[PDB]
Amino acid sequence: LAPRQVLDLEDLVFTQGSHFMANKRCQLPDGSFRRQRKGYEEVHVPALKPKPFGSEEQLLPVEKLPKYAQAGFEGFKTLNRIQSKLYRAALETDENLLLCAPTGAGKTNVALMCMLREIGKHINMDGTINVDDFKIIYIAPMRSLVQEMVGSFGKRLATYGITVAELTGDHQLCKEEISATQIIVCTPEKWDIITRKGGERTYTQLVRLIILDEIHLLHDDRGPVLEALVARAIRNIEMTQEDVRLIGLSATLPNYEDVATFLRVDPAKGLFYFDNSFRPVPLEQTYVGITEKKAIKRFQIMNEIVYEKIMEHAGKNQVLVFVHSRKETGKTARAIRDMCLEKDTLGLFLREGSASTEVLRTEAEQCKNLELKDLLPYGFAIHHAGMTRVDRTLVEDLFADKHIQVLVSTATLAWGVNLPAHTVIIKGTQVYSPEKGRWTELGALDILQMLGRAGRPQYDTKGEGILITSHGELQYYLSLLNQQLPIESQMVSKLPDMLNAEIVLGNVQNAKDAVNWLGYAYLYIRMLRSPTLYGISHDDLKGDPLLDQRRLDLVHTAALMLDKNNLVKYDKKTGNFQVTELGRIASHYYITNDTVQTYNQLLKPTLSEIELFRVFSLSSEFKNITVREEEKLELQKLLERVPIPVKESIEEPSAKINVLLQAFISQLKLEGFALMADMVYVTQSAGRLMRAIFEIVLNRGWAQLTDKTLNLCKMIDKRMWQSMCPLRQFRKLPEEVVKKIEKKNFPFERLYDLNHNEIGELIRMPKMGKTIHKYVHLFPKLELSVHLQPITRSTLKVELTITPDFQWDEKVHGSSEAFWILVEDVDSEVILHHEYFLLKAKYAQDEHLITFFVPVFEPLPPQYFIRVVSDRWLSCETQLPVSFRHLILPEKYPPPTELLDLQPLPVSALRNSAFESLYQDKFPFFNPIQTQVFNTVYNSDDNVFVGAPTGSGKTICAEFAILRMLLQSSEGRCVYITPMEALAEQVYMDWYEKFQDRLNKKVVLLTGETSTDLKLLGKGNIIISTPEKWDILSRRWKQRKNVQNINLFVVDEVHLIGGENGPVLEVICSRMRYISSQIERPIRIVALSSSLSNAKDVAHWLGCSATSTFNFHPNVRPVPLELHIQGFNISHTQTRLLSMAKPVYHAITKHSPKKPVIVFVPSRKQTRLTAIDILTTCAADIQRQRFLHCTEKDLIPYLEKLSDSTLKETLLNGVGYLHEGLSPMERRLVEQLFSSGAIQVVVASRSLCWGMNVAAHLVIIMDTQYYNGKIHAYVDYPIYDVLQMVGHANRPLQDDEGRCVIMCQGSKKDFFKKFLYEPLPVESHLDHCMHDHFNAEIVTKTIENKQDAVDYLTWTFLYRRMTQNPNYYNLQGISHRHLSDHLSELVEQTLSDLEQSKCISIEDEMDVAPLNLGMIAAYYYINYTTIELFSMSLNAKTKVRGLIEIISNAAEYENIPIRHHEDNLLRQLAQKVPHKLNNPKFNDPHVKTNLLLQAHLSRMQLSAELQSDTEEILSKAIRLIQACVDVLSSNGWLSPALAAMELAQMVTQAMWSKDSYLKQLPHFTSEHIKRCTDKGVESVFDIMEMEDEERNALLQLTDSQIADVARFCNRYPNIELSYEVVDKDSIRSGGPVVVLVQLEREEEVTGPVIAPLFPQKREEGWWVVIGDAKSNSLISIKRLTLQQKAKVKLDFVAPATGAHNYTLYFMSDAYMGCDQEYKFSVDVK
Template identity: 55%
Template sequence: MLKKQYVDEDHTLNFIVPIYEPLPPQYFIRVVSDRWLGSQTGLPVSFRHIILPEKYPPPTELLDLQPLPVTALQSPSYETLYQDFKHFNPIQTQVFTALYNSDDNALVAAPTGSGKTICAEFAILRNHQKGSDSVMRVVYVAPIEALAKERYRDWEKKFGGGLKLAVVELTGETTTDLKLLEKGQIIISTPEKWDALSRRWKQRKHVQQVSLFIIDELHLIGGQRGSVLEVIVSRMKYIANQVENKIRFVALSTSVANAKDLGDWIGATSHGLFNFSPVVRPVPLEIHIQSVDIANFKARMQAMTKRTYTAIAQHAKNGKPALVFVPTRKHVRLTTMDLITYSSADSGEKSFLLQSTKELEPFLNKISDEMLKVTLREGVGYLHEGLSSLDHDIEAQLFEAGWIQDCVLSSSMCYKDTLLAHLVVVMGTQYYDGENAQTDYPVTDLLQMMGHASRPLVDHSGKCVILCHAPSKEYYKKFLFEAFPVESHLHHFLHDNMNAEIVAGIIENKQDDVDYLTWTFMYRRLTQNPNYYNLQGVSHRHLSDYLSELVENTLSDLEASKCVSIEDDIHLSPLNLGMISSYYNISYTTIERFSSYITSNTKMKGLLKILSSASEYAYLPIQPGEEEVVRRLINHQRFSFESPKVKDPHVKANALLQAHFSRQSVGGNLALDQREVLLSANKLLQALVDVISSNGWLSLALLAMEVSQMMTQGLWGRDSMLLQLPHFTKDLAKKCEENPGKSIETIFDLLKMEDVARRELLNMPNSYLFDIARFCNRFPNVDLYVTLERDIDGKTKIGPVDAPRYPKAKEEGWWLVVGDTKTNSLLAIKRVSLQRKLKAKLQFAAPDDAGKKSYILYFMCDSYMGCDQEYSFTVDVKEADGGDKDSSKE
């Protein structure tokens, strides 16, 4: 659909078409108007020089082996970990010897629901068996945060409780993660977190000491976020080559056509490569693909609802559980209500939906989502990203216990939820992306949804019904019954990875850069499927020219953005902006934008605009029909927008930030987007402070630090600092400020009051006063001497920041700044973490002229408002012998 407001914008459409041999000379793409005569155009696509991918080897045959008993582990402590069953399934049985009785690298590719996690556990137990606990360091990488959390909960109970191993999950905060890495024996991470931690592997011996590296869902290397997965595996391969410590690689994946390439890349031998067919499952899956030939998306979804109800009535009889996946959160609610309506209208026979019982009410009373309470009473639940964690957990327990039979989920929950059912219905395989274009689900997502139709030890078979648009049917028929190939996406995301390796000193010249690429999966696929990577031939010359051009173009962009310096057209060295970009793991385009937009006169409005211009926000989706909501949000913010583009994700990010500072509820999908904006903003702000400090702008740096406090507490800088306290309202803060005798404006003022007077002023129940006391005990009270010492009760633990409006746990950080207010110059800056005591060293150049100079030392928190401190001090600059002044002062 070409809408009037988007007529000047580029539209990208992806077609998936079959190619048959012998190859035709060309295909034609035609664009024809559906309402104007003669309005059409055509484009021939020549196949004359096409090079088709190489043929794929057949999948691994599942052997008819005697199921292996759990006693094969030959260790009572290991056997107790698997008390729920007596035998391993056929796939686990076949891979057991390679994973448990050898140290070879391995790739296990099998359909979702095949028990691959236990295969990885074989490798962990092998690692534990042969090494002492002190040197055991296993890293498990899950591509999605929800999978990492699920694995942490599972393994903390299994290995932490059963084997007393230290299981830790990385947080994304570098200081915290380094401590976790040091004490952890099983480290659970996402690709982004491990990328940030392993970039400086030369200085971090604990990264070098990894003995087992497990990559889950390796097939997602072919997805949008796959480049980070590829980079960390390539880096760990390189580290294994450079250090004496041997690293064992074990990868898990769904069935893929080119598993041999993946296996060769991670160093798996033929004995360690298992690529089972997509139809080989421990619980056989019966798949029904039904097409609906209605072009209009909305009408098609409505037509699919009745078919979904019919599928549940037919395949999930006798109270068997069913999961229904729909494209968006909006469809979740609509479909849930439609299923209940169809069930109520089905008067010919008793509804198959389980009706609420009195036993359910105590659980329903704890649920905050009112509509969810209503639907659960009718026997249908729903799950989407907007539900609170408590609502989510209660409903998941009700479903698993069989108290509700059906659950409707948004498609993005397929990786985030572990619910299993007898039947899975995929209601539509397309969604609307941010540009109002219909986009097909990736095959990987669809396979993940199908994997939920597997209940080992409960069902003899599972069932899956896929409802799709008619033109997509043949495509899904092919790739759901045959393994699909995965390709690298690294060539689209090379700049930041290359910059990081230059900063780390791994790449020092252009030849190093080409050599670096040879460690990647992309390098293996270049000759296997050259046209995919825009390579015109497969000879050594073609390959060499392609890599050289790729390196030249990437380095040219990095040089233009002032991240990298190229000397003598060969040697590479990192510049300040490149180092900031790598340290905070943000895009080189973001840091270039920060550097070029910021000026010494920038005020709060400009600072927020620059912050929200970051490339990290370019993918913030504008959902269909969301434009009006965003427009209203924009109109109600403190800082206005000059002719705002509602479809611009950067404008949306800015509006969501301002709404957060105003404590304005946004609700719905916007709340999820706001969470992502805030999580990215933390590292973006720290990078912005570094860029400002590099220019030596004192007042602007202090302003950016205040924005960090605003971000954590969800307040504007002009708001009362007392609003950080739990249960405080604007009226109560105003009452405190108007307190007769002494105005209470800061938290320190409140702490100095007599207990009786404070109780009388606040007039709160004891539970509220206890919450306020707990906050005050953790509120930073710092005495600044030569060393920094925190004034704190010996019993009080310094944990995460008290910040209920910030979307995740955050450790407090501090900036030490030396500035000259007369010239507005920032002379020195250091970011520190203060627990109880700290010695910090700040160096800065002395001024050119001799004499006494007055400076101010600022101590700025990044999380709490009202605890910053500043101290004046003087430096006596004297002429040294020979007329040269002292070059620096500490």
Template identity: 40%
Template sequence: MDAVSMILDVGVKPITRTLLMFELKITPNFEELECLPIDVVVEDRSIIIDKKIVHSQYFMLKKQYVGETTTLNFPVEIHGPLPKEFILDIHNFLSYFNHEPITVAVPLTHIVLPEEEEYHPLPAEAFDVQSLLPVASLGNTSYEALYQNQFKQFNKIQTHAFQVLYKSDDNVFLAAPTGSGKTTCAEIAILRNHQKGHMRVVYIAPIRAIAQNQYREWKTKFGGGLNSMIVELTGENETDLKLLEEGQIIITTPQIWDALSRQWKQIIQIQQVPLLILDDLHFIGGPEGHILERIIVRMKQISTRVGKKMRIVALSAPITNGKDIGEWIGATSHSLFNFSPTARHVPLELFIKVVEFSDLRSANPLVRLKEMAKITHSFITEHAKKGKPILVYVPTWENVSRTVFNMISVSQAKSWVQLNSQQHQAFEASICKISNLELKSALALGVGFLHEGLNTNDQEFVIRSFEAGLIKICIISSSMCWEVSLSAHIVVLMGTEYYDFDGPSYPITDILHMMGQAGRRLIDSVGKALILCLPNKKRYYNILLRDLLPIESHFHNCLNDTVNAEIVAGIVENFKDAVDYLEKSFLCRRLPKNPSYYDFPGFIGEDAGTHLSSLVQRSMNELMTSGMVRDEGGDNISSSVLGRIASNNYINYRTIGAFSTRITLDSNIRDLLEILWSATEFEAHPTRRLHVEEDEIRVLIAKEKFPHVDNRVTNPQTKAIALLQAHFSRLPISSMNLEADRREVVLLFEKLLIGLMEVISDRRWILSYARAMEINQILIQAIWHDDPILLQLPHFTRELVDKCNDINIQNFYDLKTTERQNVRELLGLTTSEWMDITRFMEYNSFPIKHHVRMDEIFSRQRRTVDVILRTKRKRNEILIKFPHYPCKRRIKWWVFVLDDQDNVLAFKSVSLWTPNMLDVTLRFTSPVQTESASYNLYFVCDSIKGVTERRSFHVKGCAVD
């Protein structure tokens, strides 16, 4: 193998004193082979007599990824002193390559091993409380009634933490295994808040699925039981402002709260949050953990600045450095509970089994699934006596159907049917209501499954059937692990890598959550979890799942956007403020404890202030270079317009900087589209390494209206462009994962478009702004800019548009003014379809009134003119669902003030979102003259192309001395 056949880049970070994490980036550039099987071997050659292999990993390099970088992360244990270097060899399995392996020396002399973590789990006797507290300990019949159908006593963990949660306002850190009742601990803190008379709680869940489940549960429990207003924030700023004003329990995600809380100086409700609940705080150690860290720093600063106590209650899985993170949020020794992973109501037996595939080098996912189904069935046969329930997780929804077939095949279907004849007859009658044919067939054989492609009714039926014991086994796609709340005697993970077992590993948070579903409280004496993995992963999971690892900060990975946001918020006004801000982060706490993890050249215990200063200086320089920040002289800084646009719209600073650089006065619609889809944000949507997905993206690329220069199917930008153009062209997408990606990309695209429009607005380039407005309209309606206007109507196809053209109906006005009965019959539309069209036409009505107010004080022969816009809308008319847009949205209007030559004097976006009267002012200056002057208001709908209105008004003349 020639040395030029691949490029290697190796990085090493210490996790503990005995564990290093390697990051190996491989960029192959061979052309002559379809695939190249390799073996990655890491050796310790510090012992002269013998060398020691510390890691070995098989991997398949495929031709379609030539030129692409593949990243492999793997742990390496160290015993004794750290050697000066490890040797990494890349071997190949092809006999006609007779060359020596590629060898890379990985120096370790720069690595400073972290200090020994002080793991302080609560002692066993703390968990083994002698008597459980009764629910009556709440001392309030209304509170006690909330749990009357759940339990009569709090469990051991809830009992242990009850005094601090319910009798004090101390900050609390409570770490316990999944399924141990941490949510009830949060509820006890909520009841403490309610008891004090001013109910306002912000609950932050790490992902949307958890937030939605919690919203449904608490809407029933607290909304019905305590008559409290429970709201879930949407991510749409104006909607969330209203929800924040009304809500008593506000449920949200880190991204949404981070974006909203940046406006804390203008939003009094954020300043008055007495209780902040952070669920699954161990997510702070994940890729998006910097957002949680940013929220905690900000909320603590808000509490300090406004002088109002804010209580933080943080819930987490058990972690090694629980004391570290608990003290950081402000918990004391009396309010810090770090229970052991074994502190479960139902003990867990964990089995980690290596799967040696006979055709490993062929990388055939179908054969792998079948092999793992056999192992799973054998395990179930041994460990699940008397038909106990089993959950089986597979990597993607495409794997679900194949696994169902395999499980039925290896068991000959009989072992999954556990119903008597009467139950079976009733169950078969219920199955008739299932719409998915595959699911219907599987349920008849006693096997259920859940994946993203099932509709809500089918999913709910499977969940109810499993909970009722009508089916004993349920196959689930891994991405749904947070969306369903099921428990079983046995949980099986058939592989731990996404994308047909050839991709990134599941986040450890997902694995812990799946494992936590093993063991049914009050039913099982023990729960069992089986993890099937490749040989190189067993050691890693043994360490990770049996011996806890410390949580590290990811704050340094997003420092520029963080600093920019705090400059915009007015928290950071100079260099010292930025350093002070960073000193309050979890990063600052971890930096001296594991310096090499953060590329800190210092030593353990050494003052990290110099390193923080260098991080801040680098961040400031990059923000200034990109135009986000202005140097005000000395150490003082201020935000620029671009910096505010980036922060206020939650857009990466590099994206806004690129928008500013690339946009021109003459940019046409295609130019604007290309600027938008080059955004950094699309890098978060890489192509899954699945043939089915890659093939479909290639089909979409071939149908693009505006072909992109870089058509590498593995490029995230290529994927985003293909999905967006498919949206504008209304192309069907068969892959459920890709369809979900399209929805996310469309919503992201609108956010980016708003940012681009603000950049254009700042330069007052009206023609460019008008083109961007048109992109917004066609995005909502999923049409191209040169498509017929009528194609936006529900149920309308190009054939129906042609029929309308034949009878001289070209636009909405023509359709409104033509005799409707004749049109419906000519177009062959049903009464229901015509009602949908009529409802859509009602969105064209314009509910804004206006009046003009002039300033009586003249200056230099000019006067100020205010145009006051006023509207009133009913609440149920606010959010509208357009057929091709992913979610409900609010119609907005762009309003322009024009002179008699159609020059733009002022413009503003107006939202019709409140049931109350809404006043919006457009201000411009008018020359003082004796005769009246004519002006125009031009209204453009942001959601529907072709919906405009023009109104004229006059400014009276007056004599001037």
């Protein structure tokens, strides 16, 4: 709305805060009266009469409450009148509530009833509470009240096993607080600042109920915090569609109905008003308003009034007097005690000879303070915050016994102690406010609370509150305590800061959002209901009835204010708001917006300490501070001694603030109430203001100022300067010692090198040489060392090792210790790199490895520096110089191969009709790259390498090579490895269509099932595989002919040798080379890769002649790539994503407004959020629905096939999304709509970037980091994924170009420029992955001594790269001496580990030999450490119990994620499972898989995530079970081996030993198993043998389902088994016994095993086990696969002659209940 106006917010502010009196008149209850006295007037208000019970209202006994909530009322009989009117609304409904009741009427028990209702929603059937299901926020206004509430709610709810807790200070090390707690009690400000950050996995998604106690705080200057909380909550409701219950507890004051509107309370359902007659004890009130203006005699008048009033109660009533200071408490107690002595009246307080006088004299002589003993035997007492817990408890326990007569105290006791008194006197209502810089009136909440303490609840028939103030304030207090001081909104001043908080969160992205947000404020309600009070004329309102224009004007004014101070970029025409890092910092650190404007103005990298302290002193938080005349002399006494000089004159408030901070760090005590208060106020804010400065300058890279400001943060926290002995930070050390030490003036560091004796001597007091020693090694201290690893001549990879060098002690270190790692340049001037490092207690003894990239240049600089500095410990830092004097750079990479301008090659160049049938429909010509490599690939057998960008058609080049194979050899075998399973599947579709459909060869895709894969390798001409499925196969190459008979070996995407799974790929390639050299009949190798800088190393490794290596660089991509990299300055990820939201849209319109667009986003949740955001932007834009290119109804036959409604709406407006949790058919539909042109934009998650069958004109990569939940940290996208995402912007048949925009954190920008515009250098990491391959090659007899190992290493790419880039592999030279020693060390270490694990034997320290464990590890492709654990854990007595436990504990399964949101879902799961596990920790992947496996065996189906996880657990379970079978069998153990053999079946079919065989049949349920087990049928043959009609009669099943049953019944094994002991009449002891068994299948192998609940297709496996059951003894075993007919021979040794009766066992690995048993006997002689 364009005709806007800029307002003066300040002119609209209620200057008087909670003291603003909106009401013009005050009517007092009947019987009030006004006494005139000398210079002061008195107003008396009598105690009110309660109405007994009103109209038909009775007191509910706890017995009639719901039973689950009774426990929370243990120890009570019936609720009071308030709780009884409220229990239905509170316990029986979810209605939002507002309860207005006089203070102390019972409101917090009503809050307990709401809490209990919430708690009831999560009692599972075992009676405990899913305490991970919800959270409850209790917002209380004062800290003392918070602490008391935590205590009392904890006690009331302890019967429910619920944690109630407060949130304390440091939260970046202590967010586990929130996870551990169900009821969070905090202040408004704390919850504001916490939810201001947000963050993804914040536990604020569990919030179900928010309780806003003392909500009349809205009238206070603090009230806008409650308004921000409620508006934010209601907005989060709107966005996330979760509902959260809001409960307000208020005093009884006008505008309560507006407050109800503001909390979304239905006035007919949730609003309850109980007037002041419902006070627990009726209150007689006296107000004393003094008229005497002159201070000196007004003071005496005050003390006279209080003396007289206290005399009215001496000996009848205790009197609680309330004073404004910790000092005036004692001063006033003594003032009236002394005026009492002067007139001889103390005898009234303690009647003589009383037990009371003796008790008080004894407790004052035993326990002692200064004034507390100076007062306690008189009946007096004081109480405040500078008092010991035990002395406060003493005052409290003595007062409770009705022993103290006059107790003088502060508001803290009103708020945090439950201590009433018959008479209360509030002595004066003035208090010093430093924030306001002057004396002001007490706030309303304080007054209400203190006078609420009047009258003890059970001992007094009436209370007597006496308020003493200035006469001009009488109408105010009379209004406050008599239901007539209206609750107004104070938020108009805080509007800029609150608005910026919502912009930073992304809840408000433009002015229309801000208007809707402001319509949730309490300010908005009060504006509608009383516009004149808020500056709106009644005629302005009638012309703007919703105050749309007025809210637009306020938001405009605030947005202009924030934009002028650079917190926000405000586009006025569009109303759009752009966040900034400065804005974020203002919000996250609770800094007002003018202050960060100052910080942005004055902060400079050259700033000195002097200027830093001055910048601090200029904060707007101190704008009301002034330099008073009475302060000036003491301020000058300090300003001439300050260690940091102050340039400003003493007349300037900034100089005073500077000096107060410096005095505070030096722990000076000042004279002057004002100065002490002002210092407290300055320094309580200094912490977070200085932490904001530190964040600004750290993220700017300013090394020196970062150091200075982090130091200042710590000097404020710890109250000392660097110069002081850091040992002061051990509170428990005596100060005289540390003073001795730091006076001795010697470096603290040297103390580490001495012992208790020598330090005891150096300080001249050896009495505690040991003690100092302790603390010296308790001080945090890290040792640093570095491995430099050159990536190129200008990018350096650093691996920092951090070794802790101190003793941990949780009394001083807590549970973690935080540090900053800072990487600074030559001059200690720029922070080239920085990160947070957290040393957790559980890891306090381990080396920590950190790795990162820093730029470098030529000529190399002298050195960099790595500092590691404590985040909170002063003088606690290690600096490691990183010298470059001995750094070996790799050579500049060679130029690319020139792209030849050749005649584009026709398809007809294939010179083959059938061959040309594969491409001639698709295009007329091959691109320039294929045209250049064709002659070498198609007309030669040379090994070939093709390096080029993704999207250059390298796969067609490998197709050239395959076709040459097919012409050479009518039955040639080709093996094609790609590194990703999704790529393998795409290639399998396309190549199945090309070579089997068209050319009628056989194309096969390896599954991972070794017998299946061997038959595929036997029958297929094209074998497509991922690396590990080829590793397990090609290990056994000496025994497997189909492995060596390969004509052609093609490896795709070979640059991934350099990435996380590179080692296995490097190994299999090296092996293909070695095999080719052994069998002396060459195997041609074709390598395809992204553009590589060290291409020639790869080609030479794979034996590619230089003329046969095509090393192209990114500029040759056939569709030109316009790459744009925009950097983003915000270091906080959720805010950085926010700042990218709209640039995504603008990028679409600038680079591809008509043509298809993919947007890659970092997470599943982000795909949906960004699709919606793009949609919102184009809606608020002119072009709405501009991304839909078919009609709204051609789409709906597609659409109804989906389930996600959001995906439906977005697709309707032209935007799809893809993520992993979508059903495969949903993803297929979105892909088909995208590639057809219908929808223009698809938003896909990072992880799907390899299995996407769509391409686009524009790819946007929105941020380049993802959150990893295992390590709780953000990880960078591997460069390989980024290359793959960029490759998607390539449409050769449709586009003249491809465009890609990469949005990244700015500090990554230059890295991407170096590694995208230039080719990629890759390295081996096989040296880090040696053991399992060494073990395979010792099993295979390729390696038989250490020399063989060194030699075999020379075939690898690692060996080639050790010469080109020695430092990367930790060599210091490239001579043959060098790498000979390096390889020998590598070999010795790997073989020693294997020999220690008992996988290999080593004899004469030279000869290695495979052991049985290693043979098992190599056969089933299992990690050697896993098989070692297995050798440990298995015994002669394990069975189905122990086996699940053992196999859960596998290195293959510790990669299983542990996300907090299952920590109860599994807790109850571990309860429904048959095998009761042993001592459960629940942060363990091994236990998690144990329970997921018990889930799968029981057929419990779970979520989509737990299903995704079980589906990959199952792909390794069979190998692991068979490894256990092999271990147990080798040992000699019959029972445990047969148990594991049946566990194979159990895992396959998803049943148990106890469950019935019929559970294997399709469409069978428990009732069918009952009607079967009842009469006639127990097994699957029972069902085959039944009649066809009786089958259906018992089955109760469809006919399609009966055919499903029949398929299984015909694949079910029925084998005739025969056995004979060959020459059983000639058996001698110790001689050979050969038994022959013969297996004949009745109908052969139709096909694989029917196991719908097991992912991979299996084939039936069988074991033949000869044993003796008594002995628990297995004497022979063989493994066979059966194809109709098969014979097996088992040879074993005979023992001496006796009684020997053996059993023959025939056991399956797939089906249950086919296991046959034949006992037999042989006469040994």
